[PDB]
Symmetry: D3
Amino acid sequence: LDGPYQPTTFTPPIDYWILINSNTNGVVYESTNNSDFWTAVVAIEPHVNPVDRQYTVFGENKQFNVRNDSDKWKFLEMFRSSSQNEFYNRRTLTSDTKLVGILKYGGRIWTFHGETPRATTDSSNTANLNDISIIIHSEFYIIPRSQESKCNEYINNGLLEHH
Amino acid sequence: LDGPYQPTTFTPPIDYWILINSNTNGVVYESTNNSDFWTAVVAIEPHVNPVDRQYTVFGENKQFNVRNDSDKWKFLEMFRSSSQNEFYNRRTLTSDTKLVGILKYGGRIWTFHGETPRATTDSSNTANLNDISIIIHSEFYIIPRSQESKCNEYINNGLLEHH
Amino acid sequence: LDGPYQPTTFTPPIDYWILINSNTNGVVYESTNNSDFWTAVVAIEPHVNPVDRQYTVFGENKQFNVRNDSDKWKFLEMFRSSSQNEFYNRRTLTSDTKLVGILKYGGRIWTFHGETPRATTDSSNTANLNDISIIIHSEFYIIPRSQESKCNEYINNGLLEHH
Amino acid sequence: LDGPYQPTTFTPPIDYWILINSNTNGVVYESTNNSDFWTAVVAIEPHVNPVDRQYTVFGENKQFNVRNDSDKWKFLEMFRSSSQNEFYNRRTLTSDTKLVGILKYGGRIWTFHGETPRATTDSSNTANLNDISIIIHSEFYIIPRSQESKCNEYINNGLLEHH
Amino acid sequence: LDGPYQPTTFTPPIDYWILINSNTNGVVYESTNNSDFWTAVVAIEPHVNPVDRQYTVFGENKQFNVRNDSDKWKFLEMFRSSSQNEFYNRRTLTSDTKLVGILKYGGRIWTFHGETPRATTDSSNTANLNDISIIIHSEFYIIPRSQESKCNEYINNGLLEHH
Amino acid sequence: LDGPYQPTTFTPPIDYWILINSNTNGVVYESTNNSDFWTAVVAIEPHVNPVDRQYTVFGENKQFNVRNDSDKWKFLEMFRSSSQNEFYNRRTLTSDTKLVGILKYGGRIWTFHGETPRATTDSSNTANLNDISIIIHSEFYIIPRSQESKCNEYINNGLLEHH
Ligand code: NA
Ligand code: NA
Ligand code: NA
Ligand code: NA
Ligand code: NA
Ligand code: NA
């Protein structure tokens, strides 16, 4: 397991899973290529009634209507396809492991969505995969896509050394 | 909030809470003055039947019989008063926040025990408080004892920026 | 306030102010996209008569005729629009706070110029804003453009927690 | 020049100057052996009328009456010889370089006091020099006492690579 | 000498030598622009008979037939010009200093090859030099190309402060 | 394997091997308790005729007559039992792996001496083992004494992931 690495801003390499360990109910990461892909993940603690919360994403101050009816944490993918388009909750990962993953591969961005321990992967298209950089607000790990089933196991069951 | 700080080994200052954010089911920290105080905390994931697990603590390979009948994580304080005495589970913090705290103050070591969100503080005596250093295996924070009620709130309810 | 961060080389995100705290009379930062924008800032201590000083900028050894008739520090923006064009002092920030700022936004690079506490912002055009990376030689901070008035206050009056 | 090093807590080695570069008007460092020596340095920006400001020092919340009638920064050594004794401004370094130095040597703690560029060294006695650790709140450097005249030059004239 | 810097992933600036100090017989670095340039260097310890070893490069699991008949270490440049083309050992640096260098300059990637202390530089062409980033698995240094003869001296004779 | 860790100054925990990877012909580490134990290791490159070289050790400027008639590196333990006693070459580790080890255990300091791949351990006595801190000038690792045979294998054969 490569990591843990402290919060930083960098352009992740293609074909590597970025496994982020969220530690608070704020902005988990900000990922964009500044042309056609903007994704910021906000973490919602369990049992949150519909509320407007303010988040700083991509240098802007945005308001999101968020909620969480579950016992688990919810990580909301806020997406827009242009700097002028409005953010919307495109995907959600409901998790008690607090692990979030993002991968650049095959001209697409891959993340985990659904509910642990049965979260699965999905893709978003982009015309500029190379320029996708990320601002990671928490500790994170780097896993080669050749070991994705290990990343899948971490996303759904958490980081465990003992069985 | 002072932090987060990456895992390290140092002698913590007196009158400051060390708030450690555990991220796996291994050794959370190792604290000793090498004279009359040894404490290592091991993290047990939820729903673990009685099992013998091996841990490396203070350079030695030790076997502990651990269990967890709860939905929450259990952080087991393994204590001995001399390098020849046997470790025993002195205290336990049952938590879903995965936050562990240790403080050097008033000639004593203070930690949090019980079950969140109602965990409380306890003390252990020592004749050498100054030589107590720690090996921290996870991200951690530093909180002055003047802000202990904030540390108490984090231990019991987790790190939250939004309300 | 995001920081402080140790000296590093990275591609700063768009819409964030990079606030750099200079600590010596050398190269403060080097910023280029390798196509049409090169800016290196050199710091001149107070009361420097006209003198030729040598600086390593973008891997090259360059000589600049610098001076400072003021009681304050002078941060000289040395700019060229191509790797073959000659550097020239395009802008100057005269400051006693030793804080320098650079922002990528709206297809332009923004910096602070003038004299504290009345320094203002200016822009430089570029056809490739995304590829602008920076080599920062000192501690620096990251401020969202939504909080630029706070960055303006720091540039002109320094970092103050107490009023 | 050894450094710069990011803020940390450690036990400095004997016979080395710790040269700290203050960056705000807060607590610069906290140094104690927990037996007979407590020193915390607070930084006062220029032109401050007599005012009560609150500082967190050694985990406690203390109020200090501070002032600065000068154009330069003032670094106030707040000292007490026991955890029950009251802090008092024992020494002051008036500086425009914002560099502060502390040295453990010959059974004593040495710092710089006076006004730059003519600041000189002074000593404080202690019965336990080995247990003196420090919480450094800013970037700092390490200089062997064999090169103290270089540390003296930095304290009084600042860090300069060019002449 | 700029460094040492801990292992990281970043886009190196043009006109700077990246001098990497290998510390094990694994992947030294991975460099690609994701369009027409892939180079991963694997380190072979002395006296290795022809053997198939597995390496994780660019997130993929690859098998390389490697050997080393020499008393010195061999650093094998495994290159491909497209994600579908097969890796092949394009160049080799036989060294007892364990120092490896890569430079982006003049639209080309430059490395050191041959046998120390007479290793020389070579170039590889690319249509996208700006997007070449690197995953460095060991401590590394940064040297301006204006001081390449110093980098040459390090590559061939090692890092020496004393003569 | 715990590490690598960047150069730092700290008090190593008892019962852990500190495995230091030397990268130049200078001071490898400085270890003392300031009462009865001083050890600084200097690295001598291969084929050095008898020469006086200057080293900064424990803040003092000292001259050592060093030599190396071997093809391998020599790491010289310069020891004194008091701040007034003269340094002398107490032990030497002749190595082509450039790995140096120091351990605090059983009231003694343990290091590796001899010639790789047959270097063995030795002990030095001290009345104050707890106050022994170290200034490490290179990357280093931490190995529990329960895994000393692994540390022995690294000291004598180097860090190898592949067989
Ligand atoms: Na979709
Ligand atoms: Na008890
Ligand atoms: Na202009
Ligand atoms: Na006095
Ligand atoms: Na060729
Ligand atoms: Na002996």
